């Protein structure tokens, strides 16, 4: 099963080196928009304001310390994500992006910053790291506390049933396309299913056909948050009996014949 996730984002901008008044704060629950704040005006309640939007103010101060002679627009984005997996193990990441590119990350295992190999990335990261060092801004404990906040909030959303993940079984339908030169195309469509992961395949006498002897739809969004896909193969009239469609989805498995 895919893990559950909580994502915090803080974004600030400069124009010609002047850091603008705005600071955008977002909270996404399993990729889904939840809380959006424009400065302290938060929309989905004292915790929404206090500390949380405050991260954007700290970010305005960080962007003021990034030396960049290139005029026009710059952007700084801070991204925090924690994950809770099926087995109760956790992930966490803490990333900073300048003009849309990663320049700094915090590694929970080493309790250390990691920078990218690029020399311009390392210069941005040392501007920021030296600022935070001077003014005691973002210590080891801060990074561990922010991780502990994220997981505790994810655990509260999960308990409350706000991100209640439901299984939605596919509808399966098999259709036959007309017998050009004595051959028919049999198509197996699975629609309205969640989650995304599905197995679908034609079988001849109960053995799965090779990938290359079948034609494959992508897995597309199918609305109300569900998916759809299909698989096809070309057989001889007379043979329809030998060919079945096999479907596995979250422990369901079913076999669908070619209809008469």
């Amino acid at each position: 099963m895919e893990p559950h996730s909580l994502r915090y984002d803080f974004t600030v901008l400069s124009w010609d080196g002047s850091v603008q008044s705005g600071f955008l704060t977002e909270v996404h629950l399993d990729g889904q928009p939840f809380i959006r704040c424009d400065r302290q005006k938060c929309r989905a309640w004292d915790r929404e304001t206090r500390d949380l939007t405050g991260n954007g103010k700290d970010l305005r101060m960080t962007l003021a310390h990034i030396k960049d002679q290139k005029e026009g627009l710059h952007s700084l984005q801070e991204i925090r994500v924690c994950e809770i997996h099926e087995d109760n193990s956790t992930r966490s990441s803490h990333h900073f992006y300048y003009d849309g590119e990663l320049f700094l990350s915090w590694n929970l295992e080493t309790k250390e910053f990691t920078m990218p190999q690029s020399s311009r990335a390392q210069t941005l990261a040392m501007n920021v790291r030296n600022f935070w060092k001077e003014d005691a801004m973002k210590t080891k404990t801060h990074f561990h506390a922010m991780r502990a906040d994220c997981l505790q909030e994810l655990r509260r959303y999960l308990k409350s049933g706000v991100i209640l993940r439901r299984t939605v079984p596919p509808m399966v339908n098999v259709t036959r396309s007309e017998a050009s030169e004595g051959n028919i195309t049999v198509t197996c469509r699975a629609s309205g299913f969640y989650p995304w992961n599905i197995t679908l395949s034609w079988r001849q006498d109960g053995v799965s056909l090779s990938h290359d002897t079948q034609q494959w739809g992508d897995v597309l969004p199918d609305g109300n948050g569900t998916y759809q896909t299909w698989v096809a193969t070309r057989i001889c009239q007379g043979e329809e009996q030998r060919f079945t469609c096999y479907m596995e989805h979250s422990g369901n498995h079913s076999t669908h014949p070619v209809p008469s």
């Binding site: 206090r50 500390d51 005691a136 210590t139 404990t141 801060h142 506390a145 502990a148 997981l151």
Partner: protein, 136 residues
């Protein structure tokens, strides 16, 4: 009603204390921040050497200045494992609706952080600390 309604004038001013020399005085409490990192036991010993306890949080209104504090600091909050409940040095209970306690490291002590957070920390980890003395 400093007079009969609220107004700030020289006549409605008072002295705050008594407190140790050069501590923070606010609404009948004395505070000091120690920048030398110590474990919980040594932070407690240091405060008690000055006739003070570690920070006790009892009121968001009376201690609203705690909202402005940078960084993480030992306070006087300790775990009784027998019950699974938090109390202060003075044996009083943690009153509900004062602190959010956050599981950070497995441990029996808590760091104060703004706003009214307690981060569960290993009692042996060196940290800065806040001492508190009631004026009377």
């Amino acid at each position: 009603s400093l007079f009969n309604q609220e107004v700030q004038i020289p006549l409605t001013e008072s002295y705050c204390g008594p407190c140790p020399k050069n501590w923070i005085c606010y609404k009948n409490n004395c505070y000091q921040f120690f920048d030398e990192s110590k474990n919980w036991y040594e932070s407690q010993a240091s405060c008690m050497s000055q006739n003070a306890s570690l920070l006790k949080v009892y009121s968001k209104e009376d201690q609203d200045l705690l909202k402005l504090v940078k960084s993480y600091h030992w306070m006087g909050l300790v775990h009784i494992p027998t019950n699974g409940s938090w109390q202060w040095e003075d044996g009083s209970i943690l009153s509900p609706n004062l602190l959010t306690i956050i599981e950070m490291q497995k441990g029996d002590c808590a760091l104060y952080a703004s706003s009214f957070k307690g981060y569960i920390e290993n009692c042996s980890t060196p940290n800065t600390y806040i001492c508190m003395q009631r004026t009377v």
